[PDB]
A paper describes a structure:
In this work, we report the first SSX experiments with viscous jets conducted at [name] beamline BL13-XALOC. Small crystals (15–30 µm) of five soluble proteins (lysozyme, proteinase K, phycocyanin, insulin and α-spectrin-SH3 domain) were suspended in lipidic cubic phase (LCP) and delivered to the X-ray beam with a high-viscosity injector developed at Arizona State University. Complete data sets were collected from all proteins and their high-resolution structures determined. The high quality of the diffraction data collected from all five samples, and the lack of specific radiation damage in the structures obtained in this study, confirm that the current capabilities at the beamline enables atomic resolution determination of protein structures from microcrystals as small as 15 µm using viscous jets at room tem­per­ature.
Residue numbers in the entry:
A (entry chain B): 1 to 30
B (entry chain A): 1 to 21
The structure:
């Protein structure tokens, strides 16, 4: 797999795909 | 954070994998 700049909802889209059933935390405050 | 890691710089799906529950 390759790198890529993931920004805004595309990041959360990526996360969803990557994680799926496991779910994920989106926390831009870090 | 992920914004910095993946938006400001670049990242892989493995790096993204670190944020799954
Ligand atoms: Cl955009
Ligand atoms: Zn977009």
């Amino acid at each position: 797999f390759v790198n890529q700049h993931l920004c805004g909802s595309h990041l959360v889209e990526a996360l969803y795909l990557v994680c799926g059933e496991r779910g994920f935390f989106y926390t831009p405050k870090t | 954070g992920i914004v910095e890691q993946c938006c400001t710089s670049i990242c892989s799906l493995y790096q993204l994998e670190n944020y799954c529950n």
